[PDB]
């Protein structure tokens, strides 16, 4: 089963999920932030409402503003998440204009409408791997938004800090790949392979571990001998 640090996350999420308070998830790529956001939704009373997601980094300023708040129609992500949960990833990339508008939605529960407003009821979950307090000091993140956004913070441990989970998950992914390519048995990892796995920093965390292990099993391609060559870098 999962490491103590990850179990402590799951326990935190079970307590946070029922609240209608905004949650901030801090974690590297491939640590499962969106999955945690989804768990907060499905363990909440809003579980039958919508779960909407948006990656702030993916859009330029003008498109981000329209995608989040709408452009009268083109309903934005807040309107689409009404009665449910909205997950905003890579929050630190949101331009200052969007951050100010986000604060207003959090505190007033309304979207502005020029002329011709919308009240919305959305539980907000955001994610980042930036140091938001540091960006506040730099002027690149709003202090007021951070004061209202981070009711509580869920910090996902990177794989490198869950060394116990690395061989567990590696074996899991290896077995699944053996099924996919019809090997009769996963023949295990050599000690050399284990050193490679446990010494590497996994900057891509769980996604990268899966990719690495699946490639390695395929390249090895046999059940007759233990897997010795962990192919971290497919470019070599």
Q: How far apart are CA 147 and CA 62, in angstroms?
A: 25
The answer to whether the annotation marks 27 as part of a ligand binding site is yes
State whether 165 and 218 are in the same domain.
yes
- The three state secondary structure string of the chain is CCCHHHHHHHHHHHHHCCCCCCEEEECCCCCCHHHHHHHHHHCCCCCCCCEEEEEHHHCCHHHHHHHHHCCCCCCCHHHHCCCCEEEEECHHHCCHHHHHHHHHHHHHCEECCCCCCEECCCEEEEEECCCHHHHHHHCCCCHHHHHHHCCEEEECCCHHHCHHHHHHHHHHHHHHHHHHCCCCCCCCECHHHHHHHHHCCCCCHHHHHHHHHHHHHHHHCCCCCCECCCCCCCCC
Match 């971290």 to its residue by tokens: 232
State whether 57 and 87 are in the same domain.
yes
The answer to whether the annotation marks 33 as part of a ligand binding site is yes
State whether 101 and 57 are in the same domain.
yes
The answer to whether the annotation marks 89 as part of a ligand binding site is yes
State whether 122 and 41 are in the same domain.
yes
* Domains held by the chain: number: 2
Q: What order of strands is seen across the sheet that includes strand 23-26?
A: 51-55, 85-89, 123-128, 23-26, 152-155
State whether 171 and 190 are in the same domain.
yes
State whether 36 and 113 are in the same domain.
yes
The answer to whether the annotation marks 115 as part of a ligand binding site is no
Q: Which residues pair with 128 in a beta bridge?
A: 26
State whether 45 and 133 are in the same domain.
yes
The answer to whether the annotation marks 224 as part of a ligand binding site is no
The answer to whether the annotation marks 139 as part of a ligand binding site is no
State whether 63 and 142 are in the same domain.
yes
- CATH number, position 116: 3.40.50.300
The answer to whether the annotation marks 87 as part of a ligand binding site is yes
Exposure of 139 by Cβ count < 10 A (0-12 exposed, 13-18 middle, 19+ buried)? exposed
The answer to whether the annotation marks 28 as part of a ligand binding site is yes
State whether 152 and 164 are in the same domain.
no
Of 106, 133, 159, the position where a domain reaches its end is: 159
* Resolution as reported, in Å: 1.7
> How many residues are there in the chain?
236
Q: Which residues pair with 54 in a beta bridge?
A: 88
Sign of the C-alpha dihedral, residues 126, 131, 135, 136? positive
The answer to whether the annotation marks 29 as part of a ligand binding site is yes
* Residue 195: how many other CB atoms lie within 10 Å: 12
State whether 181 and 152 are in the same domain.
no
- CATH number, position 215: 1.10.8.60
The answer to whether the annotation marks 152 as part of a ligand binding site is no
What domain range is 185 assigned to? 160-236
State whether 62 and 139 are in the same domain.
yes
Of 159, 190, 223, the position where a domain reaches its end is: 159
Angle at 166 between CA 29 and CA 175, to 5 degrees: 105
32 — alpha (psi -120 to 50), left (phi > 0) or beta? left
The answer to whether the annotation marks 69 as part of a ligand binding site is no
Of 108, 137, 159, the position where a domain reaches its end is: 159
State whether 46 and 113 are in the same domain.
yes
Q: How far apart are CA 177 and CA 179, in angstroms?
A: 5
The answer to whether the annotation marks 68 as part of a ligand binding site is no
Q: How far apart are CA 133 and CA 199, in angstroms?
A: 31
Taking CA atoms, 69 is separated from 75, 101, 191, in Å, by 7, 8, 53
The answer to whether the annotation marks 70 as part of a ligand binding site is no
């Amino acid at each position: 089963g999962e490491a103590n640090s990850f179990l402590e996350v799951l326990e935190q999420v079970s307590h946070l999920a029922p609240l209608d308070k905004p949650v901030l998830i801090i974690g590297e790529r491939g640590t499962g932030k969106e999955l945690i956001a989804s768990r907060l939704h499905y363990l909440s009373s809003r579980w039958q409402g919508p779960f909407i997601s948006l990656n702030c980094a993916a859009l330029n300023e003008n498109l981000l503003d329209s995608e989040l708040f709408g452009h009268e129609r083109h309903p934005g992500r807040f309107e689409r998440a009404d009665g449910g949960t909205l997950f905003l990833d890579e929050l630190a990339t949101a331009p200052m204009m969007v951050q100010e508008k986000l604060l207003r939605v959090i505190e007033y529960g309304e979207l502005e409408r020029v002329g011709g407003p919308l009240q919305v009821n959305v539980r907000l979950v955001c994610a980042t791997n930036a140091d938001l307090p540091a960006m506040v000091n730099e002027g690149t993140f709003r202090a007021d938004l951070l004061d209202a956004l981070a009711f509580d913070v869920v910090q996902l441990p990177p794989l490198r800090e869950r060394e116990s989970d690395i061989m567990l998950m590696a074996e899991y992914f290896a077995i699944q790949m053996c099924r996919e390519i019809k090997l009769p048995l996963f023949p295990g990892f050599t000690e050399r392979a284990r050193e490679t796995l446990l010494n590497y920093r996994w900057p891509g965390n769980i996604r990268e571990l899966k990719n690495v292990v699946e490639r390695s099993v395929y390249r090895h391609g046999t059940s007759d001998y233990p897997l010795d060559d962990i192919i971290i870098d497919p470019f070599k």
